[PDB]
């Protein structure tokens, strides 16, 4: 995140941090979608050119954290992973199409003031809210404590004209126009974290996107690009249906 603001305590209680155990390293953002399930980007877990192909025992998650380096006693929780699930049509060889993965936790995480799941979008929320100019929210670490930025969704032809990457219907883009000069951006380093929207219909928060790549911030590009969660919900449901508890 760049040009964001400090997240208030319990502002983003679905926030999940994905770590490599050894050497201990923060790899990516992620989000809590139920007491046993965490959503992230596939490229955080599987990218063979960079020798990235994690097994469940290589990783952990920390949940309920707002400080990047400081232990938060009786607040933050650690969970091990039972299984990793990568979209079967994830396209790492071209454009990161279907950049989505699920991680099943070994044990249910207890909910608290600081830990609570975000909603998956339904047909109404996807149809109504994923529109150019509407803003969602991305949370992550600065490029320290959790940072927040609110970003407008970009018109689809504008998104396509702003990158050489082939933009599929499983992707959307967001961020402020460069020449406009309103500040705040999501970055490559925010990969895997959630793009959320607060529904005006029922006042609940929905995860509409996953940060898939960022072209701005520390690069000369314009926008951040997101996996379209609703577009891939059939897969999400197939995995949770068969392997949930």
């Amino acid at each position: 995140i760049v040009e964001g603001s400090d997240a208030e305590i319990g502002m983003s209680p679905w926030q999940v941090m994905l770590f490599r155990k050894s050497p201990q390293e923060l790899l990516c953002g992620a989000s809590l979608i139920s007491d046993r399930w965490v959503l992230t980007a596939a490229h955080c877990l599987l990218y063979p050119p960079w020798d990235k192909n994690f097994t469940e025992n290589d990783l952990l998650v920390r949940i309920g954290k707002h400080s990047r380096t400081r232990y938060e006693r009786n607040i933050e929780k650690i969970s091990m992973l039972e299984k990793i699930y990568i979209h079967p049509r994830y396209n790492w060889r071209e454009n990161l199409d279907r950049d989505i993965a699920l991680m099943k936790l070994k044990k249910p995480v207890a909910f608290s003031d600081y830990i609570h799941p975000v909603c998956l979008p339904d047909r109404e929320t996807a149809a109504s809210l994923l529109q150019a100019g509407y803003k969602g929210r991305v949370t992550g670490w600065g490029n320290s404590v959790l940072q927040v930025v609110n970003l407008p969704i970009v018109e689809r032809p504008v998104c396509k004209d702003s990158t050489r990457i082939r933009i599929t219907d499983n992707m959307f883009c967001a961020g402020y126009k460069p020449d406009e000069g309103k500040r705040g951006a999501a970055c490559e380093g925010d990969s895997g974290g959630p793009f959320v929207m607060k529904s005006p219909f029922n006042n609940r928060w929905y995860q509409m996107g996953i940060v898939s790549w960022g072209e701005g911030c520390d690069r000369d590009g314009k926008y951040g690009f997101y996996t379209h969660v609703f577009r891939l919900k059939k897969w999400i449901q197939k995995v949770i249906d068969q392997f949930g508890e």
């Binding site: 603001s5 208030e8 305590i9 319990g10 502002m11 209680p13 979608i33 139920s34 007491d35 046993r36 399930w37 249910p108 909910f111 608290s112 003031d113 609570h116 799941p117 975000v118 909603c119 998956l120 100019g133 509407y134 803003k135 969602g136 929210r137 927040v148 609110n150 407008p152 929207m197 607060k198 529904s199 005006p200 006042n203 609940r204 928060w205 929905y206 949930g244 508890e245």
Partner: peptide, 30 residues
């Protein structure tokens, strides 16, 4: 498993409190 109560924050919606910037999101719908 928590799906029924998803997306409602204990320190915000549950308490009838709003965070500092959620009004910006609401305004973007206008």
């Amino acid at each position: 498993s928590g799906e029924a109560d998803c997306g409602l924050r204990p320190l915000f919606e549950k308490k009838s409190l709003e965070d500092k910037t959620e009004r910006e999101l609401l305004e973007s719908y206008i």
